[PDB]
Amino acid sequence: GSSGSSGQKVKTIFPHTAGNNKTLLSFAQGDVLTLLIPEEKDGWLYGEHDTTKARGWFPSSYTKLLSGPSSG
């Protein structure tokens, strides 16, 4: 659902696979990732994958802020 403002959502505009590395999040362009930390790892941002259920590190540049919530 929706509860205030937290764990914003971002959308990947470009693909970026990890490749074994367990420090990068593997996803496809369009995939949505749930943010966890309001801060950024020096540009990089953290979140959770809406697939693998695992969380990785990705460049905020390779992600964009969604446009509206998604309650359901």
Side-chain angles (χ1 to χ4, degrees):
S2 68
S3 291
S5 262
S6 249
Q8 255 57 62
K9 294 229 228 267
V10 296
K11 162 173 256 141
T12 64
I13 57 171
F14 303 133
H16 179 265
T17 296
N20 222 340
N21 257 11
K22 55 253 272 146
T23 63
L24 317 164
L25 208 59
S26 82
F27 51 76
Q29 178 188 336
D31 289 15
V32 176
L33 329 155
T34 300
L35 288 115
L36 307 173
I37 63 159
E39 229 79 275
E40 60 189 300
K41 216 106 212 255
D42 283 8
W44 292 71
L45 265 171
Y46 205 59
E48 181 193 323
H49 198 304
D50 210 304
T51 312
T52 57
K53 314 290 245 160
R55 297 133 228 194
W57 288 99
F58 54 83
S60 74
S61 237
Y62 270 49
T63 48
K64 310 215 122 196
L65 277 141
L66 292 216
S67 274
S70 160
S71 80

